[PDB]
Design an enzyme around this catalytic site. Structure first.
Site, mmCIF file in Angstrom:
data_model
loop_
_atom_site.group_PDB
_atom_site.id
_atom_site.type_symbol
_atom_site.label_atom_id
_atom_site.label_comp_id
_atom_site.label_asym_id
_atom_site.label_seq_id
_atom_site.Cartn_x
_atom_site.Cartn_y
_atom_site.Cartn_z
ATOM 1 N N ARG A 245 -27.600 -18.154 -39.716
ATOM 2 C CA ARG A 245 -26.321 -18.133 -39.009
ATOM 3 C C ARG A 245 -26.505 -18.069 -37.496
ATOM 4 N NH1 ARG A 245 -22.101 -19.913 -42.165
ATOM 5 N NH2 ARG A 245 -22.013 -18.756 -44.144
ATOM 6 N N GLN B 24 -7.849 -5.619 -37.031
ATOM 7 C CA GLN B 24 -7.187 -5.564 -35.736
ATOM 8 C C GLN B 24 -7.773 -4.466 -34.855
ATOM 9 O OE1 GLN B 24 -2.926 -5.154 -35.910
ATOM 10 N NE2 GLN B 24 -2.648 -5.908 -33.810
ATOM 11 N N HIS C 81 -10.368 -5.469 -31.585
ATOM 12 C CA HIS C 81 -9.710 -5.273 -30.297
ATOM 13 C C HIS C 81 -10.564 -4.469 -29.319
ATOM 14 C CE1 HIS C 81 -6.365 -7.472 -31.503
ATOM 15 N NE2 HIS C 81 -5.379 -6.630 -31.252
ATOM 16 N N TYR D 96 -18.644 -12.609 -51.806
ATOM 17 C CA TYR D 96 -19.980 -12.779 -52.361
ATOM 18 C C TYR D 96 -20.251 -11.778 -53.472
ATOM 19 C CZ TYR D 96 -21.023 -15.704 -48.273
ATOM 20 O OH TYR D 96 -21.014 -16.691 -47.313
ATOM 21 N N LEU E 295 -10.424 -17.866 -33.592
ATOM 22 C CA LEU E 295 -10.641 -17.814 -35.037
ATOM 23 C C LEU E 295 -10.040 -16.555 -35.661
ATOM 24 C CD1 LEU E 295 -14.326 -18.998 -34.895
ATOM 25 C CD2 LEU E 295 -12.720 -20.018 -36.499
ATOM 26 N N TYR E 296 -9.957 -15.487 -34.875
ATOM 27 C CA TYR E 296 -9.521 -14.198 -35.398
ATOM 28 C C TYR E 296 -8.017 -13.973 -35.268
ATOM 29 C CZ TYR E 296 -12.531 -10.577 -37.361
ATOM 30 O OH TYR E 296 -13.260 -9.774 -38.207
ATOM 31 N N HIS F 105 -2.765 -14.336 -38.027
ATOM 32 C CA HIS F 105 -1.344 -14.019 -38.137
ATOM 33 C C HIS F 105 -0.811 -14.022 -39.581
ATOM 34 C CE1 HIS F 105 -1.525 -15.762 -33.870
ATOM 35 N NE2 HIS F 105 -1.398 -14.453 -33.744
ATOM 36 N N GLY G 274 -16.947 -18.668 -37.832
ATOM 37 C CA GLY G 274 -16.819 -17.267 -37.479
ATOM 38 C C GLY G 274 -18.027 -16.406 -37.791
ATOM 39 N N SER H 289 -19.924 -13.521 -35.607
ATOM 40 C CA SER H 289 -19.864 -12.145 -36.086
ATOM 41 C C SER H 289 -21.234 -11.477 -36.161
ATOM 42 C CB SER H 289 -19.202 -12.106 -37.464
ATOM 43 O OG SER H 289 -19.311 -10.819 -38.044
#
Ligand SMILES: *[C@@H]1O[C@H](CO)[C@@H](O[C@@H]2O[C@H](CO)[C@@H](O)[C@H](O)[C@H]2NC(C)=O)[C@H](O)[C@H]1NC(C)=O
Ligand SMILES: *[C@@H]1O[C@H](CO)[C@@H](O[C@@H]2O[C@H](CO)[C@@H](O)[C@H](O)[C@H]2NC(C)=O)[C@H](O)[C@H]1NC(C)=O
Ligand SMILES: CCCCCCCCO[C@@H]1O[C@H](CO)[C@@H](O)[C@H](O)[C@H]1O
Ligand SMILES: Cc1ccc(Nc2c(F)cccc2Cl)c(CC(=O)O)c1
Ligand SMILES: Cc1ccc(Nc2c(F)cccc2Cl)c(CC(=O)O)c1
Ligand SMILES: *[C@@H]1O[C@H](CO)[C@@H](O)[C@H](O)[C@H]1NC(C)=O
Ligand SMILES: *[C@@H]1O[C@H](CO)[C@@H](O)[C@H](O)[C@H]1NC(C)=O
Ligand SMILES: *[C@@H]1O[C@H](CO)[C@@H](O)[C@H](O)[C@H]1NC(C)=O
Ligand SMILES: *[C@@H]1O[C@H](CO)[C@@H](O)[C@H](O)[C@H]1NC(C)=O
Lengths: 551, 552
Positions: free
Chosen positions: B89, B172, B176, B324, B353-354, B357, B495, B499
């Site tokens: 990744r 969230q 943030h 997974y 990407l995050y 909504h 993403g 990450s």
């Protein structure tokens, strides 16, 4: 009070208090185990025998000239050796970084706060009985006594390697971009938040300072022309803050990236050269890219000059300094298949190591004059009277002083030298021997072993008493040099990993950056890979005068 | 006008102009060559057949449950597989970083200036004829029409993976700390200069704000007691700035690391839990080290909570989200013999990407109530009314919405969802297909291949016309979901590298940091390595309710 005050953990093991009078050593990945990380594992004991001493390796690199001549002309061999030099050195440095002047343990504050110089060895805790921990007297000897007895210059001792004033002023100019001590906060703090070779001493630390220095056309930097010669612009014209005494004439208040480069005409010399170099590259790139705007021309030029600086530092500056017969090579590709962190944090000790006060001569010989210190400081008129050409020729001829060997610090800067001792104690540096062990060096067992002589060693012994209490900075200057060399063992074995980590750690050395397109094509890329201290002067100094880092 | 507007170079080749109408591709270390970097070198085409599609790999990790049950109990095999997960990744991410919203070419300004979000793909140049470069119309379709036709929620579509509000609010809260947009500068700028998991949302971005939040006793953070319950202190008595509407009584103006966590009770819930956890660890450390002062107690607790966070994100959060059967593992040691850069720069695209909504429910159900958005907003009294125990229990039971699949953005936040579109255009994002190619995915040949249906595909084709002009963000919300999954291919494949890079890239994962002594000894070290979302709640929420990132 702190049980870790005696530094019990050896071989880079980490000490932690487990009670009021108890400690534990973390020997994790040290190759050792036991209470003090002193008991070697099987494979560790093997490597301990196969690995030669730094003096043995230094000897080989400084001898068999005919053999190295073969090695240098064999690319595969030269690359293999340089690769080993890079990898083996860098592993001495903690990256990401760990401690600073306020944290003898790891913390997010010590990691994230870029205002700090980082620390190769943690500070001695505040509640320790003695300045060095538990050894030595209640207080270290008088800094003035140490200064006068074994540091202050009696008679000018020249450098056996023949380093000239072109070398000395390059060293001060180059390193002033990453040693910018924030005197507001203290000696453990820096203003160079870039922590490396960003050339803020040319382009300014902040954006607003950069924009004041820029012409905003063809990517170029602002400048003035006096007598047909290109010089940095003025404070009055650019409105950038520089440090000048109030009596300096307007046209002599040169505005450059570093606010203290007006202090020395030697620093302003290189400042002018690099300024010209930047605008020269701007001219080159524009010819290659007539479709490019001012912004891209400026940024691309900067990346190129960063490359040029690193190329010169390694293959000319360090090459001369080491004394090696091996041809050192700046080649980022060597590290692409190796484990290496492309990041750096300036170590406080590296700043200390670079306090090469004995380098300075008694007088600054230019053309037919011989200026003193009081005549040299804040006098850029000397630069304009003689010109860059005369400066380069004069400074190439004038020899510099020997750093190691004791008793060679010019009295003109005795206050600075004394401050190096005081601020090292203020920052609670560990002893010489603890730093030697930190970089895999054998501790000295006597002051005579340290200096290689008897007179200075006797003065030191009367002062410190215990060799394990000898301070790092004074030792560097009194250390027994290498055979006909400028430095002793400690200066090199400590400074070189700090240096190469900061050079190769630069993001332009990373595989995603180390491409021709990053520097505007093959033409830009070639400027980096063909850069030299000679071509820099040839390509910025009128008449193109010869120059090198030795007489 | 710029000869690179068409994005000609491929396979991560770099485009550079050589004239007003001429370009050259830098194919260095791409494995390809030729004018457009499309000619595979010998070793390259070999791997081109040996490399399975991301959908195939996802199929394997989401099936053969009995097999993974065997694999998960074999430490060597588990570690080996997790090792592959981390390395494969992270190679997609530029580290050190490169482009930003103002630089489509590498520069020292783009590298050094931490106030920028970085960019995985450079911005489309200003002098390009079309927003996407050369394709599509002079202007992109109306964002309002895109939002209403294929994004807005008609009827609530619950997550097939059963994600709950504990998951939704954790996402969230957690994110943030590194998604902190500097709206004064622009949507391409950030205030999180730490660019990762530093827990500034708990301790504060600046030292000044941190000190005002600290008790300076036993390394603890300030707190107040309300009805025998521990809560954050107030603005009045810390003087740390928080964002609250003027009608909120000072006794309800809780002061925490992040200035916007008062906006949502679900955010304030986690802020309290983490506040409690910090002070809990300070107690544990003090027991182990009665000789430690306040400063070392505070700092060491912070490193441990950083460890706790990364542990929970990987082994619980990502674990649930991925779907997974393989047991993910937080083990920094796995990267010690691998080429890895312990550094990170938050990517603007990762933020985009995050923008989950559709995760948001229509109402927030606490106990027996069903609060609307108006009622839930800036209403900390709801938290003090029900409490933390009832909050955890209620949010564990309430299911979240499906993100992919189209038409699931609640109307209450439609303005926000429109902003996500508009700001992506403002920051000059390249097209969806360009980002797919950038992450080793195959470009979509039609909108039908994107959505997996016909109705929304017809809407989009009428708006965008060309598939190569489809935007990244709206595509993520309408993309064909994986079998019974919350996400489509593009979301996970883009993403996950962002990450894992931000997680493992943390300095505490580096060999000189990953030691027991770093965290105050084996006791502190074990708090990290045994952490989980349930233990976090159990130790800090009264009654120790049973919690999870999904419903039963
Ligand atoms: C980096 O650390 C320094 C030293 O702790 C911080 O400077 C101190 O800041 C506090 C409050 O911000 C002041 O009360 C002190 O007077 C400051 N001390 C000095 C010597 O300046 C600095 O703020 C830290 N930097 C960051 C970005 O957090
Ligand atoms: C990072 O980049 C931003 C954007 O260019 C810089 O902010 C600008 O700073 C200049 C000089 O102070 C101001 O005149 C502009 O108004 C600012 N623009 C914006 C959009 O903020 C910022 O200074 C840079 N950061 C650093 C540390 O150099
Ligand atoms: C250069 C000015 C330094 C003189 C300081 C006081 C003298 C203390 O320094 C003395 O200097 C002598 C001369 O080198 C040495 O022979 C002695 O070892 C030393 O103690
Ligand atoms: C304090 C110090 C120590 C060593 C060096 N350079 C150096 C040297 F002197 C020998 C071998 C390798 C290197 Cl990198 C330098 C010069 C430098 O690379 O900045 C300074
Ligand atoms: C936009 C996005 C994409 C992927 C993930 N996590 C994730 C995933 F959903 C599947 C496999 C690996 C990972 Cl790291 C996440 C959640 C996260 O790791 O922060 C967000
Ligand atoms: C470890 O060091 C301490 C103090 O330096 C000493 O007293 C002790 O004997 C040492 N133990 C071992 C096993 O070397
Ligand atoms: C400055 O240098 C000039 C030589 O160009 C010299 O004549 C003058 O005295 C110097 N001024 C000072 C204050 O040293
Ligand atoms: C390269 O791309 C350009 C423009 O996209 C195209 O005209 C040209 O035919 C391509 N060449 C090759 C060899 O793919
Ligand atoms: C805040 O929550 C309470 C329930 O505790 C509710 O009665 C009140 O109406 C809410 N405030 C607003 C403005 O909706």
């Amino acid at each position: 009070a702190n049980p870790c005050c005696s530094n019990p953990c050896q071989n880079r093991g980490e000490c932690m208090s487990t009670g009021f009078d108890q400690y534990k050593c973390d020997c994790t990945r040290t190759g050792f185990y036991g209470e003090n990380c002193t008991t070697p594992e099987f494979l560790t004991r093997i490597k301990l025998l196969l690995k030669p001493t730094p003096n043995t390796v230094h000897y080989i690199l400084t001898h068999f000239k005919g053999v190295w001549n073969i090695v240098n002309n064999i690319p595969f061999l030269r690359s293999l050796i340089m690769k080993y030099v890079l990898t083996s050195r860098s592993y001495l440095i903690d990256s990401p970084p760990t401690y600073n002047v306020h944290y003898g343990y790891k913390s997010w504050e010590a990691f994230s706060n870029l205002s700090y110089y980082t620390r190769a060895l943690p500070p001695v805790a505040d509640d320790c009985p003695t300045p060095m921990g538990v050894k030595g007297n209640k207080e270290l000897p008088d800094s003035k006594e140490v200064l006068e007895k074994v540091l202050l210059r009696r008679e000018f001792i020249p450098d056996p390697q023949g380093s000239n004033m072109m070398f000395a002023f390059f060293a001060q100019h180059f390193t002033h971009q990453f040693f910018k001590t924030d005197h507001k906060r203290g000696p453990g703090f820096t203003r160079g938040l870039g922590h490396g070779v960003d050339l803020n001493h040319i382009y300014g630390e902040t954006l607003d300072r950069q924009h004041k220095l820029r012409l905003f056309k063809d990517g170029k930097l602002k400048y003035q022309v006096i007598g047909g010669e290109v010089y940095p612009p003025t404070v009055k014209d650019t409105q950038v803050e520089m440090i000048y005494p109030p009596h300096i004439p307007e046209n002599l208040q040169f505005a450059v990236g570093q606010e203290v480069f007006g202090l020395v005409p030697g620093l302003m010399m290189y400042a002018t050269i690099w300024l010209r170099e930047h605008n020269r590259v701007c001219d080159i790139l524009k010819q290659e890219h007539p479709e490019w705007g001012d912004e891209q021309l400026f940024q691309t030029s900067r990346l190129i000059l960063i490359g040029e600086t690193i190329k010169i530092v390694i293959e000319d500056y360090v090459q001369h300094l080491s004394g090696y017969h091996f041809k050192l090579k700046f080649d980022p590709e060597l590290l692409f298949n190796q484990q290496f962190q492309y990041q750096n944090r300036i170590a406080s000790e590296f700043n200390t190591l670079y306090h090469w006060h004995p380098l300075l001569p008694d007088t600054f010989n230019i053309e037919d004059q011989e200026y003193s210190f009081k005549q040299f400081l804040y006098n850029n008129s000397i630069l304009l009277e003689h010109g860059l050409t005369q400066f380069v020729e004069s400074f190439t001829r004038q020899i510099a002083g020997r750093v190691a060997g004791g008793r060679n610090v010019p009295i003109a800067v005795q206050a600075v030298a004394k401050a190096s001792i005081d601020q090292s104690r203020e920052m609670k540096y560990q002893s010489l021997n603890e730093y030697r062990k930190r970089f895999s060096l054998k501790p000295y067992t006597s002051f005579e072993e340290l200096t290689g002589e008897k007179e200075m060693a006797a003065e030191l012994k009367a002062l410190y008493s215990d060799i394990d209490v000898m301070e790092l900075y004074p030792a560097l200057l009194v250390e027994k040099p290498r055979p006909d060399a400028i430095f002793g063992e400690t200066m090199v074995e400590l400074g070189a990993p700090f240096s190469l980590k900061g050079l190769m750690g630069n993001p332009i050395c990373s595989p995603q950056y180390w491409k021709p397109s990053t520097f505007g094509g093959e033409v830009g890329f070639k400027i980096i890979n063909t850069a030299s201290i000679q071509s820099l002067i040839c390509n910025n100094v009128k008449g193109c005068p010869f120059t090198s880092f030795n007489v």
